[PDB]
């Protein structure tokens, strides 16, 4: 029943770079250090067991370090499925605790978003509502605004978005916009638009359609 | 090879029980030791409690102790947790694991969540490849997973054949109450008309299942 600390505990890392993410204990834990990693939705995995030592098939790049209250993860060489949260665990008192991972973020290159909108679909108008949805699609970095002009006239706040991690092999992002508003609204208008704007893009993407008649 | 399962999660009104179950395959029970950890949304794994197969041995972590308990059954494989008087606090992940000193296998996760709330089972809607002009190289179609509660809905498309250029996204609880999610793939415009793409939704928690057809053009 030690508290176990990370620091720092989000990162952002270019491909190839070190990372040193550090975790310490409260009290002298004897080199019971072990380090697990999760990718977003999954099990944990056991990294490096008793500060030092590899679990099976875990990657070269990968080491531990440290005694008493101090030890450290390394990471060598970012590789771009390094994408995870790691966690330090103690092993030598009861209960075993954890640290409150670190969030490594792999920094790579622009990469534009490729922007697509969807008409409401017939059945959906049929339940008494429309959602419009654009998509912006395998850009970097997570920064990008959207806004969404029904007739060349901002919207507000009728729009929820959602955003994924980042992808295990080329490190970008995907933004979910939906639009909702119900039919009587969506029929009483023609042009939908959604505006996007982000730093590998010149010039802010619009992606629009006809027809509040669906 | 081994398999810890674990499941019985699920919607539980504020006081109710749960049990969950953690089921094994692979290697001799009696062996290692099991235990429960627990990880709220978007946060720190937690440890809840262990028992050792051979002698029923069991450490219980104090805050859960009071309300929670761990069994085993020896005869089926399976690791137990009874779960009392659910706070919404206790909403999480719950894994089961294995050995010690370090766990090195670990299960999947059941999710429990407590809210006052019902079960809804989702709508799913048709996010149609819009003109083969606008979408000129690559096309997108998907799903929109609309209205369920709670978590989770899988989604796949073509009963797991299609793999590569899905997005799910996260799900928004929306203004309802409930929730909405979707998932996109990135297909071949040139396919367009040489193959059907079906997205197939299952949301457990009120078993149910859809596979949708999500064909060509959109608003009219």
């Known amino acids: 029943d030690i508290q176990m600390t990370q620091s720092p505990s989000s990162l952002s890392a270019s491909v190839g770079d070190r990372v040193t993410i550090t975790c310490r204990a409260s009290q002298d834990i004897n080199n019971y250090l072990n380090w697990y990693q999760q990718k977003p939705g999954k099990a944990p995995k056991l990294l490096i067991y008793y500060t030092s030592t590899l679990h099976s098939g875990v990657p070269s790049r990968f080491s531990g370090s440290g005694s008493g209250t101090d030890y450290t993860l390394t990471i060598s060489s970012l590789q771009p499925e390094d994408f995870a949260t790691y966690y330090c665990q103690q092993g030598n008192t009861l209960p075993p605790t954890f640290g409150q991972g670190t969030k490594v973020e792999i920094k790579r290159t622009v990469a534009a978003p490729s922007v697509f909108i969807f008409p409401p679909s017939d059945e959906q108008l049929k339940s008494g509502t429309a959602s419009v949805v654009c998509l912006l699609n395998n850009f970097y970095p997570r920064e990008a605004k959207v806004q969404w002009k029904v007739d060349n006239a901002l919207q507000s706040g009728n729009s929820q978005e959602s955003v994924t991690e980042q992808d295990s092999k080329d490190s970008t992002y995907s933004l979910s916009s939906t639009l909702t508003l119900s039919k009587a609204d969506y029929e009483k208008h023609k042009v939908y638009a959604c505006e996007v704007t982000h730093q590998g893009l010149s010039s802010p993407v619009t992606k629009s359609f006809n027809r509040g008649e669906c | 090879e081994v398999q810890l399962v674990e499941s019985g999660g699920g919607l539980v009104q504020p006081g109710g029980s749960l049990r969950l179950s953690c089921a094994t395959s692979?290697?001799?029970?009696?062996?290692?030791?099991m235990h429960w950890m627990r990880q709220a949304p978007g946060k720190g794994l937690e440890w809840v409690a262990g028992?050792?197969?051979?002698?029923?041995?069991?450490s219980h972590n104090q805050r859960f102790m009071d309300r929670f308990t761990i069994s085993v059954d020896k005869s089926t494989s399976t690791a137990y947790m009874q779960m009392n008087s659910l706070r919404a606090e206790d909403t999480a992940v719950y894994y089961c694991?294995?050995?010690?000193?370090?766990?090195?296998?670990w299960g999947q996760g059941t999710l429990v969540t407590v809210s006052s709330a019902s079960t809804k089972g989702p709508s799913v809607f048709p996010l149609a490849p819009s003109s083969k002009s606008t979408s000129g190289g690559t096309a997108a179609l998907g799903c929109l997973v609309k209205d369920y509660f709670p978590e989770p809905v899988t989604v796949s498309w073509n009963s797991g054949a299609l793999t590569s250029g899905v997005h799910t996204f996260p799900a928004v609880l929306q203004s309802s109450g409930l929730y909405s999610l979707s998932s996109v793939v990135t297909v071949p415009s040139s396919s367009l008309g040489t193959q059907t793409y079906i997205c197939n939704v299952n949301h457990k928690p009120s078993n149910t299942k859809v596979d949708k057809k999500v064909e060509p053009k959109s608003c009219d």
């Open positions: 028992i050792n197969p051979k002698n029923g041995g069991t």
């Open positions: 692979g290697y001799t029970f009696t062996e290692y030791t």
């Open positions: 694991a294995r050995w010690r000193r370090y766990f090195d296998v």
